[PDB]
Amino acid sequence: PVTGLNGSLTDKKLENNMRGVVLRVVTVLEEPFVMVSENVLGKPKKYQG
């Protein structure tokens, strides 16, 4: 606090490129392009195709 910064405290920036993105995707259940694998009532279902 007497004189301020010397060099730098740290490297600048640590945000991971493109990462942390979440997307909401829409689909129609046409075979074999998109099939429902696991079929359970409560928990969300799995998709293979």
Partner: protein
């Protein structure tokens, strides 16, 4: 015949109409209103009719 359907009915102006009409969309989207139809109608006419 295109674009007609079944629907639940309520007393006129009854306020609860919208809670059902939202919940039905969540039931359809997720993927659970299909198991109920494939239970009573798995389209399995052993004999040809």
């Amino acid at each position: 015949v295109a674009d007609r359907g079944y629907g639940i009915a309520l007393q006129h102006g009854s306020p609860y109409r919208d809670v059902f009409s939202q919940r039905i969309l969540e039931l359809q989207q997720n993927g659970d209103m299909d198991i109920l139809k494939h239970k009573w109608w798995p389209k399995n006419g052993q004999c040809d009719l």
